[PDB]
Amino acid sequence: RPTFYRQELNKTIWEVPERYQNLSPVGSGSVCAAFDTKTGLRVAVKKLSRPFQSIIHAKRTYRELRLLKHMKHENVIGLLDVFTPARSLEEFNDVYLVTHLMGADLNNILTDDHVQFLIYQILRGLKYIHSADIIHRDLKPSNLAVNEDCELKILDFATRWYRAPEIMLNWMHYNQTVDIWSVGCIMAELLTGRTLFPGTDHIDQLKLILRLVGTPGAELLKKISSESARNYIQSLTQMPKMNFANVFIGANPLAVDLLEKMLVLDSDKRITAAQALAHAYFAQYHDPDDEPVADPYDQSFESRDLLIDEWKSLTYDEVISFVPPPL
């Protein structure tokens, strides 16, 4: 067991191993930048807020730790460390997660060669995440961290602007390509400097999407199980799919083509992350021998209904069994 030291930061007491120095608040649970004396690198230390106050929080804490412990990929945030000051399960109340400090998010931060490299890395990270049967579900520029030489990592598994239309419309059985929709929205915004679909609410959001991609055809309508959803669709004035070359004028034609394959209303026909990596737009980065998949991820706990102290004990287990990665 390491030696801890305590301090007050903003309104919170932080108790962390002496390993971590120079704690400096970055955001509010709450995050501090720190200096990792073991590695010489800067890290982000997140202190979770009320991690076990309810069943829902307890399961969410467990879920976040399990996910972070699983991710081992250059384009996905991974867990450098996890610790608690508690010496036993009985006094276990606080959880700290340690990750690489990334420079800035993509919302803060383009040339076509920069868009190529950034979207390539997102898709590389998504191929990995999707191969574990994990769906990010909330991809957006603020969930994409980039450092100064344009290396990107996905973290944190308006919001609505990047959300797949089948999620807006409340479909229960959506697939992993909801994330590809988000990548398409992000890529469009990097190419044009403008939010693709800046809807004011959920109905406006769908109206903006349908203006670009067109109203569903009969091929899509015959797969829609909801009578109300089918009628809503067939009630709107049919819009033709717009020609993407017209909308994204002057963009690299290969980028227009990939956007056409990502921003498809029918998610059965939307391109996958693995397929997108092989698209000609990424010709100078694509390496099928260096786009790895993930180990299988046991998601069975999602279907379980447990007590607060049970989720809490399972989380404690995962803290104790954590093995730091090689330096």
Ligand X SMILES: CC(=O)N1CCN(c2ccc(-c3nc(NCCc4ccccc4)c4ccc(N)cc4n3)cc2)CC1
204 is catalytic: no
DSSP collapsed to 3 states, 296-318: CCCCHHHHCCCCHHHHHHHHHHH
Nearer to ligand X, 23 or 220 (CB): 220
Write each residue from 117 to 156 as x if it is in contact with ligand X (CB under 6 A), else as -, in one continuous string.
Answer: ----------------------------------------
Residue among 229, 247, 254, 308 that touches ligand X (CB under 6 A): 229
Q: Which of 156, 201, 257, 289 is catalytic?
A: 156
Which residues touch 114 (CB under 8 Å, ≥6 apart)? 150, 190
CB 32 within 8 A of CB 67: no
Among residue numbers 184 through 223, which ones bind ligand X (CB under 6 A)?
206, 216, 220, 223
**Least CB distance to ligand X at residue 210 (A):** 6
Residue type, 277: L
Residue type, 124: R
CB 22 within 8 A of CB 5: no
Using the Cα atoms of residue 214, residue 220, residue 221 and residue 224 in order, give the sign of their dihedral.
Answer: negative
Does residue number 265 form part of the binding site for ligand X (CB under 6 A)?
yes
**Least CB distance to ligand X at residue 170 (A):** 5
CB 46 within 8 A of CB 31: yes
Write each residue from 230 to 259 as x if it is in contact with ligand X (CB under 6 A), else as -, in one continuous string.
Answer: ---x--------------------------
Which residues touch 310 (CB under 8 Å, ≥6 apart)? none
- Tell me the window of 91-99, 104-112, 113-121, 169-177 that interacts with ligand X (CB under 6 A): 169-177
DSSP 8-state code for residue 156: -
At residue 144's C-alpha, the angle toward residues 257 and 180, to 5°, is 35
Annotated ligand binding at 46? The verdict is yes
How many residues make contact with ligand X (CB under 6 A)?
A: 19
Residues with catalytic annotation?
156
> Which residues are documented as binding site for ATP?
26-31, 46
Q: Residues within the annotated binding site?
A: 26-31, 46
Per CB under 6 A, residues contacting ligand X are 165-166, 169-171, 206, 216, 220, 223-226, 228-229, 233, 265-268
